[PDB]
Structure 1
């Protein structure tokens, strides 16, 4: 069944794969290594934006943040182009999710305040959603580079799925803020070859990707069936057998997602 197919994907890509799809009223949970730890990588940027939204009025989105070239210490497709002008908190949220912008993520972490440049506050926000598992210990780009087995900067497919479920389908955020998070994930630019590539075109997919060393490739998504039925899909992977320089394999995530989509259809 599904377990054997996931295991064959692991063999095919020389990878470790984790999958979680929460149960619904009519479907069973799908789980494969769902309670094993995997590095967040940039998937944390989605609940990070939720934390900032939660903690502030909507007018906070229009606050201008200034930063320097030396502040850019991670891949930052949007922030690279706005050193002179700055970026608003809302623009940083947009960039963090839609382009996986690392400087935007670090500035949003800083905006949360507190120890660890915001990382403790972020972890605290997850705790407020009942996630006692995940932890963020570093900012970008260090958080994507911990050795396999290190618990720093890790979550589990199970844990992050339940968090994303509350944020997008639940009531963790009031409707107006929830709609912002959902819109940013819906217009993500980095996910076409991952969960999106596993679901037929008549399914809606919103997502946030993560990529790291040791061949890390993650994607977390909410998907809607052609009749409007929602599901949460978390897929995480690494290729520790290839060492630090191992190439991430998007096709592994696309194949895993295709397996999931077939079961959910």
Structure 2
């Protein structure tokens, strides 16, 4: 599978990272799995988990007020609710299903402490056993770190294990686990990434990320028709093309098609 992935890199003029944890009956899959890639919006999934972890469910009903000023990035939802504000739960919802920039920042602020909550967020990843990932900026900055910069990066290996713990493990109590899972299930932004590479009778829930330098990611939990779960982390960028390099969704879809062929 190493050969096919390399071929995808040259076919799409990109760097590709894949990680699929091993299961009782499937070997792990690994390609540049320990190389660093920018999070982009993929961090919003563990972010919601952080918020859920730190509070009882009733916190979800806490209304957050904000102004026009508090919108500095792509925020499809937060733009619509400026006059009323949004509850923590709505911000969680906006962050996973619409990748809303302000929603993510308001949740970072909810976590508390330095860096507008980025330190607390990294701390939470550390508490999960993730020694690799780091978040240093908020939106939109965190998507604009150049190649080579370590700020706001994870690895496929690291983020896959994190997602596994959160969705399939017991990092959260079942109630909180179901909310995170449910939100991810109702996301549609990933229809052309991992979802496109798996057969349509599989279940796929995911969180995407996109950025400069041809950056496109997708992190997913997938279930076979028989109810057999897997975790799939696919990350890419095209630094060779500079800031404006186009991201390629189809690279991720093809990568996923290879993964699916092995697991099916």
Report the 3-state secondary structure (helix = DSSP H, G, I; strand = E; otherwise coil) of the residue aligned with 2:209: strand
Report the 3-state secondary structure (helix = DSSP H, G, I; strand = E; otherwise coil) of the residue aligned with 1:70: coil
Answering whether residue 109 of structure 2 is matched by residue 126 of structure 1, we say: no
Report the 3-state secondary structure (helix = DSSP H, G, I; strand = E; otherwise coil) of the residue aligned with 1:234: strand
Question: 1:233 Cα shift?
Answer: 0.1
Tell me the residue number matched to 2:143.
144
**Over 4 Å off, 4+ runs:** none
Question: 1:176 Cα shift?
Answer: 0.2
Question: 1:258 Cα shift?
Answer: 0.3
Question: 1:264 Cα shift?
Answer: 0.4
Residues of 2 paired with 1:201 and 1:155: CA distance?
A: 29
Residues of 2 paired with 1:229 and 1:149: CA distance?
A: 37
Tell me the residue number matched to 1:117.
116
Residues of 1 paired with 2:147 and 2:196: CA distance?
A: 27
Question: 1:149 Cα shift?
Answer: 1.0
Residues of 2 paired with 1:74 and 1:7: CA distance?
A: 34
Residues of 2 paired with 1:106 and 1:144: CA distance?
A: 13
Residues of 2 paired with 1:80 and 1:215: CA distance?
A: 27
Tell me the residue number matched to 2:165.
166
Tell me the residue number matched to 2:73.
74
Report the 3-state secondary structure (helix = DSSP H, G, I; strand = E; otherwise coil) of the residue aligned with 2:83: coil
Tell me the residue number matched to 1:234.
233
The alignment yields a C-alpha RMSD, in angstroms, of 0.4
String of CA shifts for 1:129-154, please: whole Å, max 9, x gaps: 00000000000011011001110000
- Length, aligned pairs only: 264
Residues of 1 paired with 2:116 and 2:174: CA distance?
A: 29
Residues of 2 paired with 1:237 and 1:176: CA distance?
A: 33
Q: TM-score scaled by structure 2? A: 1.00
Question: 1:70 Cα shift?
Answer: 1.1
> Unaligned 5+ residue runs, structure 2?
none
Report the 3-state secondary structure (helix = DSSP H, G, I; strand = E; otherwise coil) of the residue aligned with 2:69: helix
Tell me the residue number matched to 2:82.
83
Residues of 1 paired with 2:247 and 2:102: CA distance?
A: 22
Question: 1:189 Cα shift?
Answer: 1.9
Residues of 2 paired with 1:230 and 1:23: CA distance?
A: 11
Q: TM-score scaled by structure 1? A: 0.99
Question: 1:209 Cα shift?
Answer: 0.2
Residues of 2 paired with 1:237 and 1:32: CA distance?
A: 11
Residues of 2 paired with 1:238 and 1:66: CA distance?
A: 36
Report the 3-state secondary structure (helix = DSSP H, G, I; strand = E; otherwise coil) of the residue aligned with 2:176: helix
> Unaligned 5+ residue runs, structure 1?
none
Report the 3-state secondary structure (helix = DSSP H, G, I; strand = E; otherwise coil) of the residue aligned with 2:219: strand
Residues of 2 paired with 1:85 and 1:152: CA distance?
A: 34
Question: 1:109 Cα shift?
Answer: 0.1
String of CA shifts for 1:76-135, please: whole Å, max 9, x gaps: 110011110100000000000000001000000000000000000000000000000000
Residues of 2 paired with 1:189 and 1:118: CA distance?
A: 27
